[model samples]
Target: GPLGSPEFMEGVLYKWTNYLTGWQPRWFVLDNGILSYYDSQDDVCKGSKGSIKMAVCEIKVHSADNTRMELIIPGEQHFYMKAVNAAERQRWLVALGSSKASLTDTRT
Candidate 1:
């Protein structure tokens, strides 16, 4: 567990591949401070394909791109992801921001 659980949120988002190869759809689940994603939403019982903790990552909104974002994890992984539209992107951003700030709240 990365941190105490908050309201859980999950959805599907398109992630940009390395070197701008292409966009891949993934099922993402945000629970506590851990953002775990699966290859398919229907395959949740199989387990997550991968996950990133918001506690150690920075969520950045794209300056010029309406559907893009940057998840900077400092010395670890720097991930760039995109959503289907601006609304979708904003939803994820808000959820991620809340999850991130909750970690700080718990410490005090």
Candidate 2:
């Protein structure tokens, strides 16, 4: 409901890695402006492994390769994630897109 609130969105998506697990599954949450994630959905109490804010990020959908998406913040980082299926990918894509859109609308 609010920034840093206890609200969350759960989905299994990949967070690109440099190890053998190039694309590993992670429990993701799009709360407020931060998209925090954990190793498992049930282990949220341990805190998020990491997070990225949607306040000034860009969302890109890969139609040519369904289930692929990217969250980019020029000069900061580029997060490339993928869903299990196109439908699931689309859902997260919309959610992320809307998060940034709302930010833009507010400052307008």
Candidate 3:
């Protein structure tokens, strides 16, 4: 699956298109030294990987510093930005974009 396994915190993350729906903060103890989730569910077949694009959703937070969080929409459901002022559009050009929908295999 291009979106790998959209499972989070012991549950499956659902994907809805055409109207844009999203999910987040689905945390769990990852022993794999990395974090993952579904930022977007592409109905794209493997043969059509290069023809997909998405718009990222803006995640606004209060009184804290962090990248809101995205990668679950067509382009991204929520984008990370440093909202240190609570009313600023800090998301721009480049940021620590989260990598979700990717998968890794660990079988030892």
Candidate 4:
């Protein structure tokens, strides 16, 4: 329920990654913004203290078959993933990548 909570965002990102790869990773939400150019930040303006309808993350996982990969959104924000599953995760991720989402995410 916190705004742009990095903790929450990290959790969501982890779930999304797991849904895509069936695994998790070792990470710790940073206390501040990340230093990069590929960070498609969502909205962590309040810094985990605002009504964040969306969030961002910064991972360090990248590879074709990289099981130990991380998805550093490279930004901070607020969002929830604990309540999402594989299908939902896929929908969210797809929307995230394409920059869009809706109430009726018919993904499976």
Candidate 5:
């Protein structure tokens, strides 16, 4: 499917909430160059807790954990996410990378 699709990618990923709770599972969806996370798949209809546009965000991987990655919008938004496994993380990374690239591409 095209990266601009409304449902380009969807999966369960662990999101860093705070020091107390650490990582919590959330349902994430990459659509229209926006990455949004819901409390769960059922809560998607209620709206996302927060979302960041991939066009301005930077994607990074964890140094130690093979399944971990981070998305940062400079000092604005930071999303620390972990997939179920290394392979899963790879899939998300490819999807996210392409989506960001497509959104930022200037060619007509």
Candidate 6:
């Protein structure tokens, strides 16, 4: 499954807003080594709220919460996202890890 292939994924996840808005549902897609999120699935045609290159992102899992994860790109970007449940979180984790690894492999 190459980047941008059907093997990549898209779904709605809760994203943490830096402001008091807290977590809000957003649509996310992992493709072509980039992870992009939009206000909603339909909004993808318009544009994305933000995006990060998986090659540079550091994926982190929550120590206490099975549904939480973080994507950090050093001082540039930080995304706090949550899944609907533990099982969903695990699926995202594996997908993200695989995508990141694939990008890394191409660099070498």
Candidate 2 residues 32-81, lDDT tens each?
76777677867777877667767766666535647888777656666787
Per-residue CA lDDT of model 5 for 17-107, tens digit only, reads 7899977888888887788777778899887778877777766643453787878776676678789998888778767766544455332
Model 5: lDDT equals: 0.73
* Candidate 3 error regions (>4 Å): 1-29, 38-63, 70-108
TM-score of each: 0.70, 0.69, 0.18, 0.23, 0.72, 0.72
Better of 1 and 6 by lDDT: 6
Clashes of each: 0, 0, 14, 12, 0, 0
Model 4, 15-108: lDDT tens per residue? 3444658634222223223212212244333243332222244222122322222333323422223213555343333333222222222221
Model 6, position 52: C-alpha lDDT score = 79
Worst 10 residues of 1 by lDDT: 99-108
Error at 43, model 6, angstroms: 1.2
Against the true structure, candidate 4 reaches a TM-score of 0.23
lDDT of 1 at 8: 68
Tens digit of per-residue lDDT, candidate 6, span 1-108: 235646577787787776888678888888767888777777889877678777778666534648888787866765777889977777677667675554553332
Candidate 1 on 26-91: residue-level lDDT in tens? 788777677877877678778766788777776665345477776766566757767789777766
Kindly indicate the candidate among 3 and 4 with the higher lDDT.
Answer: 4
Task: RMSD for all candidates, in order, please.
Answer: 5.5, 5.3, 13.7, 13.1, 4.7, 4.4
Ten-residue region with minimum lDDT total, candidate 6: 99-108
> TM-score of predicted model 1?
0.70
Computed on alpha carbons, the lDDT of every model, listed in order, comes to: 0.69, 0.69, 0.26, 0.30, 0.73, 0.72
Cα error of candidate 3 at position 55, Å: 25
lDDT of 3 by residue, 1-108 (tens): 112543221212222233445433321111122223332333222222221122122222233443342333333334232222322222211121222222223211
